[PDB]
């Protein structure tokens, strides 16, 4: 689909579930895919600091 | 083709020299003898290797039809000169000289590679040709003539880095630059480990890393070798895969001196069934014993070998005869003691060592200007 706001959330949550289940570089890559996707949301007033 | 041709010369390097170890050797030499159209080097083993199979008629027809597949077009070319270009065309010897190295021998390689050398004057043509002289330089292992064309490609073909002939500047730090001068050409020239992947001609990476970790811990003792082997990340993944690499690394740095004989013998047991079977530890073990000792005798200037009976290994008499070998022939700077049971060390001072060094170089330059004073002036 085209969606942007929810896709930042599910990549951020998958960045948890490999670090919580002990996988660094896959969680590092899934973090970075959420970084470049969050460059298109005009109002992340709470999701910014959640990502931060 | 020629990129999996690394295996055949290495397995041929493996077979005959262990005389007792020849059961599984002949079980896959038959894969290397009659398959892959491999022709020469076992007929020269006719009085070297075993009795034989009938390898004569089945393969002399297979060398013939495959030569007759090739020998017609190579010697004639004349085909696209019908439309009169340069009275020649460039499709003949640059495309079939590779068979003249793979299945054809070095004689068919040497006359073809120099024939296509003066054909095209590009470095990109001189790229692949010189690298074939060097790959066959491992094949028939004529390891003196192919020491030349490396430097002849270091001079003219090497103009830089910047991914290039760096493809086979993976012919400039594990075939020719560090062999039997090896104290520091493993040291200075192994600084880069910078890639991971196994492409279709990168057939050896993971076992290649087991080389460059067994030669890693050699260059520098502790002026931060520990970052490039433990804090390094691409080396971290393979020790996460391989425990024999990991435990042997983490024995040495973490100072588990007792498990060294375990961790050396596991390396030694790996060195029992390896192809390298002519000239061996031109660095390793009882230098790695003195590498273990140089860090152990450091920080302790009054040591007892009763403490050596459990911290490093057993055999109180075995350590005692071991250090008698090492001290007495100019290594391992210390002074062992009898029935007080002391291992005492002595060190040069910050000036006694340099006064010993300036007296050596001063005599060499004085002897030098002795001679040049009298060559001139009668």
């Amino acid at each position: 689909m085209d969606d942007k706001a929810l896709l930042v959330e599910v990549q951020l949550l998958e960045s948890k579930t490999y670090h919580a289940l002990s996988n660094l570089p896959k969680a590092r890559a899934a973090l970075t895919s959420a970084r470049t996707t969050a460059n298109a949301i005009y109002c992340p007033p709470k999701l910014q600091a959640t990502l931060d | 083709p020629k990129n999996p041709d690394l295996r055949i010369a290495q397995l041929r390097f493996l077979l005959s020299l262990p005389e007792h170890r020849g059961d599984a050797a002949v079980r896959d030499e038959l894969m290397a003898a009659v398959r892959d159209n491999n022709m020469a080097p076992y007929y020269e083993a006719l009085c070297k290797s075993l009795d034989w199979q009938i390898d004569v008629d089945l393969l002399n027809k297979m060398k013939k039809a495959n030569e007759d597949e090739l020998k017609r077009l190579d010697e004639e070319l004349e085909d696209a000169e019908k439309n009169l270009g340069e009275s020649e065309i460039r499709d003949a010897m640059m495309a079939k000289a590779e068979y003249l190295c793979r299945i054809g021998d070095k004689e068919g390689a040497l006359t073809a590679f120099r024939k296509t050398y003066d054909k095209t004057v590009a470095l990109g043509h001189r790229l692949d040709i010189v690298f074939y002289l060097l790959r066959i330089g491992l094949f028939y292992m004529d390891n003196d003539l192919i020491t030349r064309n490396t430097e002849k490609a270091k001079s003219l073909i090497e103009e830089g880095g910047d991914w290039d002939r760096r493809n086979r500047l993976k012919v400039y730090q594990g075939l020719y630059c560090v062999a039997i001068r090896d104290f520091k050409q493993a040291a200075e020239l192994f600084l880069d480990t910078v890639s991971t992947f196994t492409s279709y001609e990168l057939m050896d990476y993971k076992t290649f890393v087991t080389y460059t970790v067994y030669v890693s811990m050699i260059a520098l003792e502790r002026p931060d070798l520990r970052e490039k082997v433990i804090k390094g990340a691409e080396i971290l993944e393979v020790l996460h895969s391989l425990p024999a690499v990991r435990q042997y690394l983490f024995s040495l740095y973490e100072c588990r001196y007792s498990v060294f004989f375990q961790s050396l013998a596991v390396v030694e047991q790996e060195m029992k069934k390896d192809w390298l079977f002519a000239p061996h530890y031109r660095y390793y073990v009882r230098e790695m014993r003195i590498h273990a000792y140089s860090q152990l005798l450091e920080s302790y200037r009054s040591l007892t070998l009763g403490y050596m009976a459990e911290a490093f290994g057993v055999g109180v008499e075995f350590i005692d005869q071991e250090l008698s070998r090492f001290i007495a022939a100019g290594r391992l700077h210390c002074k062992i003691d009898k029935v007080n049971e002391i291992v005492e060390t002595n060190r040069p001072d910050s000036k006694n060592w340099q006064y010993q060094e300036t007296i050596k170089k001063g005599d060499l330059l004085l002897n030098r200007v002795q001679k040049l004073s009298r060559v001139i002036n009668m």
């Binding site: - | 439309n83 009169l84 270009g85 340069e86 590009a122 470095l123 990109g124």
Partner: protein
């Protein structure tokens, strides 16, 4: 020589001595005759244009006698055009090696 420095008197404006040329500014910035290498036919996606260059540059060089027999002049100037950076530079770099 023309365009050459000289030493000149301040009173009688007489020549004393030919001063040397400092550099030759054309021949200091003489354009490089660097090695004609190709990256080969593997510029695919341009092969129609590659066939045009062979039939206008290589075919005069390789086959003079087709022009000598038929009696037609060989070309000497080819114009390339398009958007910049689409291989205006790097294609004629390659063709000079193929010949």
């Amino acid at each position: 020589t023309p365009n050459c420095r000289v030493a000149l008197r301040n009173d009688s404006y007489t020549l004393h001595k030919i001063l040397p040329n400092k550099v030759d500014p054309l021949v200091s910035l003489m354009m490089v005759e660097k090695v004609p290498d190709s990256t080969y036919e593997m510029i695919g996606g341009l092969d129609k244009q590659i066939k045009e260059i062979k039939e206008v540059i290589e075919l005069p060089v390789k086959h003079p006698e087709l022009f000598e027999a038929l009696g037609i002049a060989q070309p000497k100037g080819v114009l390339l055009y398009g958007p910049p950076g689409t291989g205006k530079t790097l294609l004629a770099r390659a063709v000079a090696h193929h010949t």
